[PDB]
Amino acid sequence: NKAAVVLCMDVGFTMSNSIPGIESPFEQAKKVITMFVQRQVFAENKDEIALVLFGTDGTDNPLSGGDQYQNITVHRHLMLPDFDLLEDIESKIQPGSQQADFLDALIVSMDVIQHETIGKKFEKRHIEIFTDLSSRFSKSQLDIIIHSLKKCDISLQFFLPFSLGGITEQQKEGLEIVKMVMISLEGEDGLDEIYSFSESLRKLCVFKKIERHSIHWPCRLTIGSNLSIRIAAYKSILQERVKKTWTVVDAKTLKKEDIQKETVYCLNDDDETEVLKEDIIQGFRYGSDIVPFSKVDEEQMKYKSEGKCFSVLGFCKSSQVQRRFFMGNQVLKVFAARDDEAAAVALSSLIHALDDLDMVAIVRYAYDKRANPQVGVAFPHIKHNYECLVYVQLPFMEDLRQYMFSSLKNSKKYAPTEAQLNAVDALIDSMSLAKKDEKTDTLEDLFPTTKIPNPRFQRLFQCLLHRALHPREPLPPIQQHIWNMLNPPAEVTTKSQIPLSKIKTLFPLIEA
Amino acid sequence: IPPYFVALVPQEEELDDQKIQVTPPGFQLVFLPFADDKRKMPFTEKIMATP
């Protein structure tokens, strides 16, 4: 449910001395930690983060001992991240002029996490290291370090200015040491868990997505009054909105308590009488008249139903259920009930039968007693890992629109010529967004839109952060990487340059 | 209004026996979900069914 992350950062003098073009590790590390803090602050997952620095002039640690455990300071303790951390990261943190042993940094991080995690159910425990591996050090305790890491089940990650994982011998020794630590803690899989600074930035440039949790909906799939399969339904795809809303606050006091909203009804007479809320009864319109219909009478006459129904009205061929008739604002995934082998077997039988026959199940769906009944389609979805039914709503007779449109094939004045058809063919060929894998196995998508985050939330979070930290300036423009992710690869445009010119030359487009 | 990615699927005119249109010609605009419009599902062991 919660994770404790200890950001160990090097502030040694070695990082400061670097080529300006290389973007010396100090700025990169500061930016990385800042971006991490933003992502955690604007994604309220109740994750605790602490900050420890090694390589600073001062010394403040729980353990002092002798000359060891020196030049290390715990700037922040475990707690919920907040704007103060961003402000401190931006300016409060400055480089030092000393050197420290990153092994001692790991020791102090272990001590801090172990001491502060008591009393809280932190399931995860991650420790991150930001060092140049260019400081002279001695290895004399790695065995006990690894033993403690294994016993406490603490994950460890490393970030270095370089990619491999043109360096000095000290850097090679540090690389060897980090490799041995990672191998001992995890193994072969741990080799790739070391992320350079640029690689980390490439992934931390986007605010975290809105991850809501879907609550399981239990019910019974019924085929007649004799067959019943216990099922659990989840919401797979739905349009996501902002969890929070703008709250209107007074212009000067900036308090929510200082404003009040209310509604009043007044008659249509000239005197503008006042009628209380209890004096109004709801009525409807029947042609040219108005029919009073009280709420109580409507409740008495309302359509009453027995809720929580997942019933199979029938089975129909897949061709008869078209994709352009789907309605609703959700897609449901129906699985077998948890911890029930029999239900799993029954549902698997139904799914396989439908798939073999190329059929779908037309079903009646009611979320609860007061939810309006729906008629929808459940069709199979079989994958290597799991198999489930997918439910999507279908239209009633009232929701169908009967519009007639003029034909285009038979129209005499709109028939394109052969040259126009060839030009459009060239345009379609040039602007293809999929590529075959050397005509060998399958297709590959060049612009996968399902994996692009929603730009609205990114824009909102950017503007909120900019208004919090800079409470006077205007809202910035739209970042360039948002536009880049909302546009296709430059190759498509490069290939499409000329076909569009041909299209412009052939089709006589004129604006009226 | 924030942009939404959509797909235009061509439609071919289809007429019934009585020569009455039942599928007009044009394009069908189908909305494409974003990354955050999906949700993660619990892991369930797959149990096969005998033929």
Binding site: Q402 | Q18, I20
Partner: peptide
């Protein structure tokens, strides 16, 4: 045009809702 409704001209006449009728 054949199938045009006698109540609302210009609209296709909807066949009555028959529900589920199982085939032979």
């Amino acid at each position: 045009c054949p199938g045009e409704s006698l109540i609302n001209p210009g609209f296709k006449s909807k066949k009555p809702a028959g529900g589920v009728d199982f085939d032979e």
